[PDB]
Amino acid sequence: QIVERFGFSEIMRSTLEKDNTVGTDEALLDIYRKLRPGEPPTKESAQTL
Amino acid sequence: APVTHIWYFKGVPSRLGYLLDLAPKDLEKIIYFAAYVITSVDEEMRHNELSTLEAEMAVERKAVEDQRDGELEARAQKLEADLAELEAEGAKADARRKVRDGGEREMRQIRDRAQRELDRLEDIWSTFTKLAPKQLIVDENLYREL
Amino acid sequence: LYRRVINRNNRLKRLIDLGAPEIIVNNEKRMLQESVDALFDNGRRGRP
Amino acid sequence: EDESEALRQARKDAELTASADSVRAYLKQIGKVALLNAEEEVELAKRIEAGLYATQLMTELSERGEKLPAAQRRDMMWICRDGDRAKNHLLEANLRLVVSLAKRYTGRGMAFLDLIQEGNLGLIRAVEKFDYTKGYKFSTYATWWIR
């Protein structure tokens, strides 16, 4: 979906190819573990936060 | 209880940090009760008794090995029971292999947990082996084990 | 600030005299240290 | 997922975090003890009673007593230590009730941490003055002492 919608942006398309973080759940895990240090991430806590 | 001086603890240069060869993060963690610091180690007596502590660690590892082999024998008996309940009666090959795969995943995760226990035991023993003064240890569970 | 430091020190000494869990004692000691740092250099570490 | 070293390393890294705020650090420390129930608290109270009885017997035997051998003294020492450990366990279990009660008095006079420590003192007093024989949940009795 990202590549089909935002396709002209070659610079951030290359950034995407260098994302080194695949998966929606992995993305939520990274966001939670960064913005909320010290707490154990869960499947639903990431989405609700 | 004694309290450190903020002037000599926090600053553009850390005077206490330079004196003790400790980074400001380690100094803050030690001072504000966030981690542990090994104040001193009995080097001579530790080296003298290292044979005996190594023997105790080896016997603990041996006991771990016997109990994990007992779990292996129990899982082999469970696999034998699965074979008795699967191959002795008419059923689909995929149906009889689904339970095999479920058992395989159960015992592989059990063995993975055993591997994590092995890693924690080796980490504890190594941390004791290379313990040094003024060394910071986080994760107070390791401190309690030590 | 002086009253805060006195209160924390008195509470800590009472806790250690009575016998308290080590985590409670450590929290009290951390509070006393923070109070001393606030008295000397307020706002140097953390929010003032 | 939940397995294959997916979130355990993240949990460990989160547990190894500074948490520079003192109140946040105290909450992180207080979050490491699981809650109890009626059976757990009555067993802990039984252990407290046994430890206190053993300590009283030891104090009585200290003067005008008998030379206690190792076999007769190690049991007393072990049960006393077990009682003290059970008391500490109950304290660490109920610290969450302490902070929940103490959250309501912030904003006037003293600080949140001071209120928390006063709550711990009240909890210690309640644990000392608790009585399981009444068949009552611990929170109802400890709330009055904390307040």
From Swiss-Prot, chain A:
<comment type="function">
    <text>DNA-dependent RNA polymerase catalyzes the transcription of DNA into RNA using the four ribonucleoside triphosphates as substrates.</text>
</comment>
<comment type="subunit">
    <text>The RNAP catalytic core consists of 2 alpha, 1 beta, 1 beta' and 1 omega subunit. When a sigma factor is associated with the core the holoenzyme is formed, which can initiate transcription. Interacts with CarD, TRCF (Mfd) and RbpA.</text>
</comment>
<protein>
    <recommendedName>
        <fullName>DNA-directed RNA polymerase subunit beta</fullName>
    </recommendedName>
</protein>
<comment type="similarity">
    <text>Belongs to the RNA polymerase beta chain family.</text>
</comment>
UniProtKB/Swiss-Prot annotation, chain B:
<comment type="similarity">
    <text>Belongs to the RNA polymerase beta' chain family.</text>
</comment>
<comment type="function">
    <text>DNA-dependent RNA polymerase catalyzes the transcription of DNA into RNA using the four ribonucleoside triphosphates as substrates.</text>
</comment>
<comment type="subunit">
    <text>The RNAP catalytic core consists of 2 alpha, 1 beta, 1 beta' and 1 omega subunit. When a sigma factor is associated with the core the holoenzyme is formed, which can initiate transcription.</text>
</comment>
<protein>
    <recommendedName>
        <fullName>DNA-directed RNA polymerase subunit beta'</fullName>
    </recommendedName>
</protein>
Curated annotation (Swiss-Prot), chain D:
<feature type="short sequence motif" description="Interaction with polymerase core subunit RpoC">
    <location>
        <begin position="114"/>
        <end position="117"/>
    </location>
</feature>
<comment type="function">
    <text>Sigma factors are initiation factors that promote the attachment of RNA polymerase to specific initiation sites and are then released. This sigma factor is the primary sigma factor during exponential growth.</text>
</comment>
<comment type="similarity">
    <text>Belongs to the sigma-70 factor family. RpoD/SigA subfamily.</text>
</comment>
<feature type="region of interest" description="Sigma-70 factor domain-2">
    <location>
        <begin position="90"/>
        <end position="147"/>
    </location>
</feature>
<feature type="region of interest" description="Sigma-70 factor domain-1">
    <location>
        <begin position="20"/>
        <end position="54"/>
    </location>
</feature>
<protein>
    <recommendedName>
        <fullName>RNA polymerase sigma factor SigA</fullName>
    </recommendedName>
</protein>
<comment type="subunit">
    <text>Interacts transiently with the RNA polymerase catalytic core formed by RpoA, RpoB, RpoC and RpoZ (2 alpha, 1 beta, 1 beta' and 1 omega subunit) to form the RNA polymerase holoenzyme that can initiate transcription. Interacts with WhiB3 and probably with RbpA probably via its sigma-2 region.</text>
</comment>
